[PDB]
Amino acid sequence: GSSGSSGVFVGRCTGDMTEDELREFFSQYGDVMDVFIPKPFRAFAFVTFADDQIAQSLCGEDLIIKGISVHISNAEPKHNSNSGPSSG
Numbered sequence: 001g002s003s004g005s006s007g008v009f010v011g012r013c014t015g016d017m018t019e020d021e022l023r024e025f026f027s028q029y030g031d032v033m034d035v036f037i038p039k040p041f042r043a044f045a046f047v048t049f050a051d052d053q054i055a056q057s058l059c060g061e062d063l064i065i066k067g068i069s070v071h072i073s074n075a076e077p078k079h080n081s082n083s084g085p086s087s088g
Contacts, residue, residue, distance in 0.1 A: 005076045006052035008059065011044045012070050022047060025065055030054035 019035040026032040031050035058072040
């Protein structure tokens, strides 16, 4: 366990929300290091916590934000690539 991914995918989300909203909404539970939005964004966002213990405890829990129902889950998709088609 060199670096256990503590990022969770908040599905069933919208675009109206902002990294600040969720970041502040998840700040009451623990210490959300930061909040990023990977693209293409599909009603889901990536959130990082300062502790995996907080990202796991939420895994499987249903939280309501602004009235909507978000699903907290921990997933880590595989991929290999590196930007740089041409030198220049």
